[PDB]
Amino acid sequence: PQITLWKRPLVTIKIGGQLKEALLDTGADDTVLEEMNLPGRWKPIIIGGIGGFIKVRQYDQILIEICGHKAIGTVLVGPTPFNVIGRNLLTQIGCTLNF
Amino acid sequence: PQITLWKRPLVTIKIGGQLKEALLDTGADDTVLEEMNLPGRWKPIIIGGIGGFIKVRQYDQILIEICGHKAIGTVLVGPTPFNVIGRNLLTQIGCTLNF
Ligand SMILES: CC(C)CN(C[C@@H](O)[C@H](Cc1ccccc1)NC(=O)O[C@H]1CO[C@H]2OCC[C@H]21)S(=O)(=O)c1ccc(N)cc1
Numbered sequence: 001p002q003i004t005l006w007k008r009p010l011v012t013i014k015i016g017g018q019l020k021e022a023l024l025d026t027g028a029d030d031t032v033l034e035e036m037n038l039p040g041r042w043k044p045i046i047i048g049g050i051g052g053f054i055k056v057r058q059y060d061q062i063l064i065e066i067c068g069h070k071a072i073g074t075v076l077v078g079p080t081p082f083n084v085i086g087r088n089l090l091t092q093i094g095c096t097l098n099f
Numbered sequence: 100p101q102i103t104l105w106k107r108p109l110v111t112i113k114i115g116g117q118l119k120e121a122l123l124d125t126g127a128d129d130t131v132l133e134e135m136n137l138p139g140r141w142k143p144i145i146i147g148g149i150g151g152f153i154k155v156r157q158y159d160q161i162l163i164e165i166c167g168h169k170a171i172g173t174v175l176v177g178p179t180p181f182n183v184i185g186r187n188l189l190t191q192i193g194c195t196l197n198f
Pocket residue numbers: 023025026027028029030031032047048049050081082084086124125126127128129130131146147148149180181183185
């Protein structure tokens with residue numbers, strides 16, 4: 001699908017059997033999601049943006065279905081105000097910016 | 100132009116006669132730029148992000164030429180770690196996400 005940016009580019013994602021909504025965020029290097037449980041080993045890491053930094057748990061090689069498109073990659077879990085799908089996963093589904 | 104997301108979608112902007120590089124940030128409602136003089140009036144405001152909030156000065160109806168495309172809209176000026184072109188201006192140049 002093509003998506004215009006008049007409204008927030010929100011899409012439905014399915015991860016770990018859960019349904020959620022997330023931003024297609026071209027300004028995000030990595031994918032950050034609200035608090036939730038995921039499988040495997042995770043390591044504590046810290047990410048930052050506008051306003052400061054937060055503490056998240058890094059899960060690697062996590063399967064996600066972003067608007068029906070599958071991708072496996074790193075997923076950070078922590079107190080983010082919004083679920084954002086970063087470039088690490090946007091690349092996997094072949095998303096591009098066009099103007 | 101189409102733009103892949105394997106590297107940060109940086110583009111050159113011309114604003115107030117100055118040249119700068121900025122992110123095409125679909126996750127950003129509005130445009131936020133590093134400190135700089137913007138001829139005209141403004142009002143103090145506060146935007147929030149991943150890990151906190153910053154104090155920025157709001158300028159309205161500011162001309163920016165993004166990657167050769169002209170647009171006029173609100174531009175926030177403050178201690179942002181990076182210059183990001185938000186949806187308020189991305190819509191003006193007809194930017195879309197495609198996958
Ligand atoms: C909080 C988000 C929903 C929206 N943000 C834009 C987002 O793309 C920022 C834009 C951004 C980019 C670089 C530095 C600061 C902010 N990136 C970000 O927070 O990503 C973090 C997770 O992945 C990592 O990638 C870099 C930062 C980390 S934001 O910076 O807070 C923002 C909010 C409001 C406006 N008008 C403009 C920008």
